[PDB]
């Protein structure tokens, strides 16, 4: 792989549900790449259906200069109006992917736990989720890193 992801640090975690995601990413480009590199953050609104995935943000750079690069990838929180009530509270997934010439070469997945923090709400959760009272906890210590063979030339 001509692009290697050296580190991903999850920032501002845990945080309120409405806070933007912040991932500090360090990567190495072994050689100059003439085409475009695109990073994306995708929120899994529903483990029951991929139709509820929300692309929170995307960053594009091209050509890609060789060397060591670092940036904080920030994305606004998902739209709660598109999250099924059954999936709002509890564990879900957030993904960071990178593509080169449209080919996905790396996917970094985290479990995300959205939970109430006050006793009354944890003991009597409202039938309609209250996103203003949810805390997002990204399970940052163990991301699932998947790499894919792509054509770099």
């Amino acid at each position: 792989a001509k692009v290697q992801v050296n580190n991903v640090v999850v920032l501002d975690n845990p945080s309120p549900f409405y806070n933007p995601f912040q991932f500090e990413i360090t990567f190495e480009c072994i050689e100059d790449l003439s085409e475009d590199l695109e990073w994306k953050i995708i929120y899994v609104g529903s483990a029951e259906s991929e139709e509820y995935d929300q692309v929170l943000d995307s960053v594009l750079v091209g050509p890609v200069p060789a060397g060591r690069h670092m940036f904080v990838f920030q994305a606004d929180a998902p739209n709660p109006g598109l999250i099924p009530d059954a999936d709002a509270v509890g564990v879900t997934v957030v993904l960071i992917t990178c593509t080169y010439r449209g080919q996905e070469f790396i996917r970094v997945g985290y479990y995300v736990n959205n939970e109430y923090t006050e006793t009354e709400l944890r003991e009597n959760p409202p039938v309609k989720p209250d996103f203003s009272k949810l805390q997002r906890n990204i399970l940052a210590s163990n991301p699932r890193v998947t790499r894919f063979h792509i054509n770099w030339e």
Binding site: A47, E48, E50, L95, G109, Y110, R144, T146
Partner: peptide, 9 residues
């Protein structure tokens, strides 16, 4: 319908 908790992979 929760048995895709392998979306992280």
């Amino acid at each position: 319908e929760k048995x895709x908790x392998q979306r992280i992979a």
